[PDB]
Amino acid sequence: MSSLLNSLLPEYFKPKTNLNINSSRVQYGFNARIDMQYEDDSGTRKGSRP
Amino acid sequence: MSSLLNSLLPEYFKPKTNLNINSSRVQYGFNARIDMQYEDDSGTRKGSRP
Hints:
The structure is cut from a larger assembly and holds two copies of chain A. In chain A, strand 1 (37-38) and strand 2 (43-46) form a beta hairpin. The first copy, chain A, starts with a helix and ends with a strand. Chain A is elongated and about 55 Å long. In chain A, strands 1-2 form a two-stranded antiparallel sheet. The first copy, chain A, has one helix at residues 2-7; strands at residues 37-38, 43-46. Chain A is 12% helix and 12% strand. By secondary structure, the first copy, chain A, is α+β, with helices and mostly antiparallel strands. Chain A is built from one helix and two strands, in the order αββ. The A-B interface holds A 38, 41-46 and B 38, 41-46. Strand 2 of chain A pairs antiparallel with strand 2 of chain B, so a sheet runs across the interface.
């Protein structure tokens, strides 16, 4: 059933037809922007991985 | 004139009669609590001298 397996894919994922696989290992994932924060009595230390 | 020289003294200063001076040098002043702060794009670093 193509229909039920299609709904499992994420909303942001827009797939194309061809995929040129040339190896026996693939790292599928996503890139996200994490805005980390460390608060303490002394003060706050902010970080950001884009 | 005792009156005009009396008004120059601070409000918090409550003087007593006797002062036992035993040297040719005196460091008059006051003790205060300073709450310092350093803010930056990275974060805030707070200090306090009581």
